[PDB]
Amino acid sequence: QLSDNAKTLHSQMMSKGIGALFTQQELQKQMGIGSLTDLMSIVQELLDKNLIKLVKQNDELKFQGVLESEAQKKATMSAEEALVYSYIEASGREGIWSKTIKARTNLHQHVVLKCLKSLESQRYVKSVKSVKFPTRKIYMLYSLQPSVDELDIEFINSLLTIVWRFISENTFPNGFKNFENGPKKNVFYAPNVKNYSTTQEILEFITAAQVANVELTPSNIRSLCEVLVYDDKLEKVTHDCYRVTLESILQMSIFNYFKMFPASKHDKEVVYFDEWT
Amino acid sequence: LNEEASKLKERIWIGLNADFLLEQESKRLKQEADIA
3-state secondary structure of A100: helix
Please give the residue range of the domain that contains residue A116: 70-140
Contact A244, A234 (CB under 8 A): yes
3-state secondary structure of A217: coil
3-state secondary structure of B35: coil
Q: CA A95 to CA B19: how far, in whole Å? A: 34
Q: Is A273 left (phi over 0), alpha (psi -120 to 50) or beta?
A: alpha
Contacts of A147 (CB under 8 A, 6+ apart): A93, A94, A128, A130, A131
Contact A158, A210 (CB under 8 A): no
Q: What is the DSSP letter of A191?
A: G
Give the helix/strand (H/E) hosting A237.
Answer: strand A236-237
What Rg value do the Cα atoms of chain A yield, rounded? Answer: 32
Q: Which residues on A lie below 8 Å from B33 (Cβ)? A: 123, 142
Q: CA A184 to CA A246: how far, in whole Å? A: 11
Which backbone phi and psi does A218 adopt, to 5 degrees?
-55, -25
Query: Taking CA atoms, what residue in A is nearest to B26?
Result: A121
User: Which residues of chain A come before a gap where C and the next N are over 2.5 Å apart?
Assistant: 149, 252
Length reported for chain A: 277
- What's the longest Cα–Cα distance across chain A? 100
Contact A142 B36 (CB under 8 A): yes
Contact A230, A236 (CB under 8 A): no
Q: CA B9 to CA A43: how far, in whole Å? A: 54
B33 touches chain A (CB under 8 A): yes
Query: Taking CA atoms, what residue in A is nearest to B33?
Result: A123
Window 4-23 of B, Cβ < 8 Å to A:
none
Q: CA A145 to CA A142: how far, in whole Å? A: 7
3-state secondary structure of A241: strand
User: Cα distance from B7 to chain A (closest Cα, Å)?
Assistant: 34
Q: CA B28 to CA A43: how far, in whole Å? A: 41
Contact B1, B12 (CB under 8 A): no
Please report, for the domain that includes residue A107, its CATH number.
1.10.10.10
Q: How far is CA A26 from CA A17, A124, A191, in A?
A: 9, 30, 69
Q: What is the DSSP letter of B9?
A: I
Which backbone phi and psi does A21 adopt, to 5 degrees?
-85, 0
Closest listed residue to residue A83, CA positions, set A62, A64, A104, A67: A104
User: Cα distance from B33 to chain A (closest Cα, Å)?
Assistant: 8
Q: Which residues on A lie below 8 Å from B34 (Cβ)? A: none
Q: What is the DSSP letter of A96?
A: B
Contact A143 B30 (CB under 8 A): no
Closest listed residue to residue A116, CA positions, set A131, A128, A134: A128
Looking from the CA of A62 toward its CB, the CA atoms found within 13 Å total 14
Q: CA B17 to CA B23: how far, in whole Å? A: 10
Q: Which residues on A lie below 8 Å from B36 (Cβ)? A: 126, 142-143, 145
In angstroms, how far is the first alpha carbon of chain A from the final one?
86
- Sign of torsion, CA A140 A144 A147 A152? positive
Contact A102, A109 (CB under 8 A): yes
Tell me which method was used to determine the 3D structure.
cryo-EM
Contact A15, A38 (CB under 8 A): no
